[PDB]
Amino acid sequence: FDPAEKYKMDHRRRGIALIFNHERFFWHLTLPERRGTCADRDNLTRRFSDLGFEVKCFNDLKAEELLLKIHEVSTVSHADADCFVCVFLSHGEGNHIYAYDAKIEIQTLTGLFKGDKCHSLVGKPKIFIIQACRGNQHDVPVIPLVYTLPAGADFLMCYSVAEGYYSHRETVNGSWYIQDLCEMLGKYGSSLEFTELLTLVNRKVSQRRVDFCKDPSAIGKKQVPCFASMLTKKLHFFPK
């Protein structure tokens, strides 16, 4: 048993990174536009391309179209890839994100990549990154005083905020979480272990606060990101 075991990241390709980027919504959902989201999209495109990913973006897809595209990707072979990345930039609440016209439960999307459904990603990291609100709590500031594999294995779910909370987006620079994620990818993505790097992102995002707001009650409010690992090995993105 090797405590230092790393995923094999020596396939011919790093893999695909999908970015679903949602700026506007069907009028009847009564959801506000998400200015700054195309900055996140572009930022991520640069950072993941630099790590060797083949980045593919889709803008304001309807739910049916979104589902079709993710199904397609889950069905093409990833045999010669190291991993798979899928990013959602949108509104959300509870356990769902919004496509242009309707909510989608996040588990609907991830289930398509479980090992029985996507054999060519078995044993490979399947990384989902979600910039979206997750409920209606606004976090307050405080100060200190044969070995087979499970079909559910090797996912990493990277959320911009902990369960139940609002997440924040600057109208020009992009979301707090994506800005800080991209800064850390830029500096450390090609060297640090990926969950180590996500932890740094947690610290960066937790230092930010709502500095100004039309609602004075929301001034100084906060956000902590949250990642869930079902990974079984250390994950690095050393230059290929």
Binding site: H168, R169, E170
Partner: peptide
């Protein structure tokens, strides 16, 4: 800053 806006809420997502």
């Amino acid at each position: 800053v806006e809420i997502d």
